[PDB]
């Protein structure tokens, strides 16, 4: 099976030039790989940007250009804007199949480019504790504030509290004070939420999210379902 | 809830819809308001921050305003993909906490923009099964091949399956990872694409996208032009 490889992350200042590359494990990337570039802005669905090495989508700005350079596919952004912050995926055609690279997380220096990955679903008995993890991949973890929001089935959003990944200070929702603990691990870029003395009404999807300069949550984790039931497993 | 919003509202495609949120001096009155859009089983998505600012990628048809102790979300030129639950959120000074409205579920009642609306995602046990749907609009569905592409949390894109149009004998293709477990199909009379997912494994956990091809100039057709919003499929034993 062919493997497509990309830089995991890059940073560019507004107005700068950045070159993203896409390597094939089979040899030099050729026009016969019809290199495609797909853009995924923070919290958005992806959208095609470049196809057939250098063909622009109708919505692709002139500042983006696709090419081949030294055996790799290349995506060049000339005069980067804050709007260009995204995860960029390249895809190469190998006879009867598109193989995607792992993506390049491009941060535009200003709220950097990250993906949040939460731990799996949990089944708990009343009285037990649950510890949910939230790992950030991309721009420097300590630049972030992490907030926890939960949602019971068919109900509204509920703020649980938040923490700074820079200094570790917390603020918890009044209802949960003394039952909830939020922590971070700098070495692993992971935020943690522990909720103790679980009861039936704790059954919800638990989300972690980054915090804005404005206290708005731009990037969210996929959520973690916690089911609290008498029977348990 | 601290913030008050109507439980539901309906509107037609191409029309304008407004969603209002009522608070007090301690919250909306003196703090910046945010708006979130939420599709079923998936995470909220930031639409508006600082009362009226859009993050990049949020269409210009979404707008926000604040007047005294009330805030309003405006959606002009409604699209089928705008059918979602909308939440207002702000900081409450008297509580020293983030507060949310109860959410307004917007129902949106060929035409419009290219839209790929997904449903059917959810949480299932290993060995379970799910059926995903993609309702297409804004183009002649029966002339297009469609693809399913998935993205596991914090990971890259992986092609799943392809179905050609009627003009190419509805030819189907599958990634080796899903061969014999998944079935791609379509119902042209319903403008719908399906993904039947049987014998689910924990490694099938991902956001699943339906994708439609598009012209990239007059000499190339990218399979990856238009994408749906995605539907989350979680396959877990729940630590059992």
Author numbering:
A (entry chain H): 1 to 110, 117 to 239
B (entry chain L): 2 to 110, 116 to 246
Paper text:
Here we describe the discovery and development of a potent anti-P-cadherin/anti-CD3 bispecific DART protein, PF-06671008, capable of redirecting CD3-positive effector cells to kill P-cadherin expressing cells. We showed that a bispecific antibody (bsAb) composed of variable regions from a P-cadherin antibody and variable regions from an anti-CD3 antibody had potent T cell-dependent cytotoxic activity on P-cadherin-expressing tumor cells. In cancer, bsAbs that co-engage the CD3 epsilon subunit and a surface antigen on the tumor cell trigger T cell-mediated killing of the tumor cell while circumventing the need for the direct interaction of the TCR and MHC class I in complex with antigen. Oppositely charged coiled-coil sequences (E/K coils) were added at the carboxy terminus of each chain to drive heterodimerization.
Crystallographic studies of the DART protein were undertaken using a version of DART 35 lacking the E and K coils, replaced instead with poly-histidine and FLAG tags for purification purposes. The purified coil-less DART 35 demonstrated CTL-directed killing activity equivalent to that of the DART 35 construct containing the E and K coils. The crystal structure of the coil-less DART 35 protein was determined to 2.0 Å resolution. Missing amino acids in the linker regions were not modeled into the structure because of the lack of electron density, very likely due to disorder. The 2 Å resolution crystal structure of coil-less DART 35, arranged in the VL-VH format and separated by a 9-residue intra-chain linker on chain 1 (CD3VL-P-cadVH) and an 8-residue linker on chain 2 (PcadVL-CD3VH), shows that this DART construct assembles into a tightly packed spherical structure that differs considerably from the previously published diabody structures. In contrast, the DART 35 structure reported here shows that the disulfide bond formed between the two chains keeps the diabody in a compact configuration and reduces the distance between the two domains to 5.3 Å. The two antigen binding sites are separated from each other by approximately 30 Å and are facing away from each other at an angle of ~90°. The anti-CD3 CDR region is positioned remotely from the subunit interface, whereas the anti-P-cadherin CDR region lies adjacent to the interface. DART 35 and its optimized derivatives, 153 and 154, which are presumed to share the same epitope based on near-identical CDR sequences, show binding to all constructs that contain ECD3 but not to either ECD1-Fc or ECD1–2-Fc, suggesting that these DART proteins bind to human P-cadherin within ECD3.
